[PDB]
Amino acid sequence: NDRKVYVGKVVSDKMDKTITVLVETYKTHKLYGKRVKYSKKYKTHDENNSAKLGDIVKIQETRPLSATKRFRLVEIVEES
Amino acid sequence: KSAIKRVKTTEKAEARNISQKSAMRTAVKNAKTAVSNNADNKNELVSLAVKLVDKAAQSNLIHSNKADRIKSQLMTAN
Amino acid sequence: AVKIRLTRLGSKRNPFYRIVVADARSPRDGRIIEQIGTYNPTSANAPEIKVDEALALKWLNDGAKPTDTVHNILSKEGIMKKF
Amino acid sequence: PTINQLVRKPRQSKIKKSDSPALNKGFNSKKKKFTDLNSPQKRGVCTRVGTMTPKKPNSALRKYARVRLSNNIEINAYIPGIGHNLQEHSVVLVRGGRVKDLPGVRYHIVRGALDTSGVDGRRQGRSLYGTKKPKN
RNA sequence: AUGGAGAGUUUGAUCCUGGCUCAGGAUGAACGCUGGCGGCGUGCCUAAUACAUGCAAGUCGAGCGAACGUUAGCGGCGGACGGGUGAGUAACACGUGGAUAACCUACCUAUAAGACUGGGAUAACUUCGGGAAACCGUAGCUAAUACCGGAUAAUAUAGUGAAAGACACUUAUAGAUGGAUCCGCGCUGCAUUAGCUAGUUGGUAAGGUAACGGCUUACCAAGGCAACGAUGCAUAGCCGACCUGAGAGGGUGAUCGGCCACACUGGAACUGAGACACGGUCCAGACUCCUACGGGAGGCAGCAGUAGGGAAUCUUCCGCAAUGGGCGAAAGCCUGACGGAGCAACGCCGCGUGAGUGAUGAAGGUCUUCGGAUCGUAAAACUCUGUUAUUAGGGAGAACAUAUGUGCACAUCUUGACGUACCUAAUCAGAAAGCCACGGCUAACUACGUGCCAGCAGCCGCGGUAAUACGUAGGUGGCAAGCGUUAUCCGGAAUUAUUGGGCGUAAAGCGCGCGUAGGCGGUUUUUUAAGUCUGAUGUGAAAGCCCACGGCUCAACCGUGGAGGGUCAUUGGAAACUGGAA
Ligand SMILES: [Mg+2]
Ligand SMILES: [Mg+2]
Ligand SMILES: [Mg+2]
Ligand SMILES: [Mg+2]
Ligand SMILES: [Mg+2]
Ligand SMILES: [Mg+2]
Ligand SMILES: [Mg+2]
Ligand SMILES: [Mg+2]
Ligand SMILES: [Mg+2]
Ligand SMILES: [Mg+2]
Helix, strand or coil: CCCCCCCCCCCCCCCCEEEEEEEEEECCCCCCCCCCEEEEEEECCCCCCCCCCCCCCCCCCCHHHHHHCCCCCEEEEECC | HHHHHHHHHHHHHHHHHHHHHHHHHHHHHHHHHHHHHHCCCCCCHHHHHHHHHHHHHHHCCCCCCHHHHHHHHHHCCC | CCEECCCCCCCCCCCCCCEEEEEEECCCCCCCCCCEEEEEECCCCCCCEEECCCCCHHHHCCCCCCCCCCHHHHHHHHCCCCC | CCCCCCCCCCCCCCCCCCCCCCCCCCCCCCCCCCCCCCCCCCCCCCCCCCEEECCCCCCCCCCCEEEECCCCCCEEEEECCCCCCCCCCCCCEEEECCCCCCCCCCCCECCCCEECCCCCCCCCCCCCCCCCCCCC
């Protein structure tokens, strides 16, 4: 039994751990069969790990501990 | 119409209970007061409150982790 | 709290029964934990005993109860004193 | 059209203009609101009778009424019959279906309906426009 | 492969786009005018409007306060589960799939164990007093598996429990059991709704909750959301399912199950493991009656009924025999949960109001030019039959223990509301009738009054004097205990076209540039593995549809094992094309 493992870029960051995580994904439309792409804006927290314009890093869901952030990982690979 | 017995059982029940719970909140009131008062109750008062949350804990009138938050809020202040 | 189902299935004017792990407060056709067989209560059946009780062996071996005077079908089985 | 402008503004079915538009709705007594019912028949009381003549390919002259239904949606309904009824302030039971060539009627009156049981001098119609005394 | 049809109508005629209307199935259906059967399923969908009236959860004293195996009141549980309706809710409420290094739980039954010492008090009881009663207090008691003090014991960083059979209660580890929160994806219409949000979005604390958290306050700050449709209004309880469809799709949500939300309307707590509680308390408000008017009462969205509004949906019914549901050791017990009869033709089917004969066969209807066909082998009047009617034995679901012999298990004695059913056996002719049409779509033709009148109408249309389209008559056609009509959905409709349409003149190309957001992309070599392809699992409950099987005199209807339960979940795996990078 494990956490989530989603990866993806960021938009920016502000003070106090506002590690928002943009995630892009594909889906079909339900009838016409076109491969439509769409995103989702997520949130997680850390110390000073990321910055604006490109901080693609995996996150992992945990107990909530916020009002919107429900991921506890900032494990970093690619950046600017 | 079985409730018309139950109208005055619970009245006697909490009518007894709120005094014991008020003495529970009063019995713990002087304890963390007393550790920051530099008083003579560095002993013999925290164990009184441990008797209060213990004797309250034996009844169902307070939940278990609540009493863990009194004990975890008092002996951990030592 | 866990019990054994004896519900009123089948065509009307012909009260049948299905045997399943039930609960004491959920109703007859209510939420079913797991199946425990059936029995032809039709009183016009020669071969009827339908309890493959290896999938019902966990019930009385983990805290069941007898059901509501179905005890003579509990008589034709024998699952007790094995422990 | 191509697919990208077809997953963007999708298909959108045709509207359904419905027959008997002056029906299906019950305006409430307490709450004083229109509703939706999809009801087969409704009551109503009558105001006029009259008869306008012209039906340009049909050319005879026939009568009509102005019933208004439960909670006052006034209407023009056509009376089937060689004879008629003799009642102002009726208790009709109206019926859908447009008698054509009269501009402004889409509704019938069922003969009988606890106000007038139709015409007495008709034998082999026997359910239309209110007859009786058959033992066929 | 067990899988799809069309017709009429624009003109003097023909093609072609385009509407319009039929032929099929449906139903929690009604209304007309005529009605006899049996086996089932189902009946305020408009007012979640108001309740005159009776009834829907009560049980128990071997623990202890009355008479001769009958009563209290303690208290022990139980009223948080059954049952009921859709008002609100476009939301993690539901449907699917996961997460608890965020968490809870007595009732049942594994263990590992205890009941030590007391003491004090109080209901009932009686007495007084006041109030048409209602509400109450005083006075003196006395209990009780009802309270409570100290004794020594895990689970906090050192800590508390026990009142019962004879010769039951409680303290921990557990299981199952029900919960609770969060997360990914899936959730109708309006752009003639484009700027929302201010504890609003983060941090540190302080608390508080079973549990983390902007859940609440103290500061610190700036955020967070959005053309991948935020906010706003309007409407709608969701789902496995049901109806339609060859399939793709489209339309529904009452039956019968899963899950919410709600109980005159609003709030907030109480006891309780568990409610912010349908048959509970407290507050404010609007209904509603009793009324010494002094204060005092209840909640039909539990069964039947009235008033209302309705197109319309009923017994002010009987019984626990069974099933489960509580309590009590155990009988017993309260149950409009449930089981049966009402009551309606409300669907679905299963039969039969007659039978072998019987010469044109008829008296009498119609056609008639009448010579003869027609109703019509119809009819008699012979010959034939019990289905309906007087009596009968009329006795399917119908079981399981508070015992004794053996060592909670076996055999052996204990329980029927509807009592019509199955039955057999004499044997009647008691109405299988009435609806609608008849010119073409689409099987069904002649006469009489009527003459653009009165009148039919799904559509084109029929009648201005001889209408097969009006109203009758006769005959014929389709029906079947009904027929037909109005109303809602799907197909026909490829008339919303992903399968499966078009834009010159028929409806349809922006007046034409430059352009961001988004959509699509030449040629080759490498690596990747998101889309792609594949297979090992966990899962999509059951009732229902699809075929097989047993049973109901076959049928309607029931039980058995399988498709088969979709986009998913985690790793194995292949790398031609689309991404992704050199
Ligand atoms: Mg023209
Ligand atoms: Mg009401
Ligand atoms: Mg209803
Ligand atoms: Mg009325
Ligand atoms: Mg016809
Ligand atoms: Mg006619
Ligand atoms: Mg076209
Ligand atoms: Mg250009
Ligand atoms: Mg570009
Ligand atoms: Mg397997």
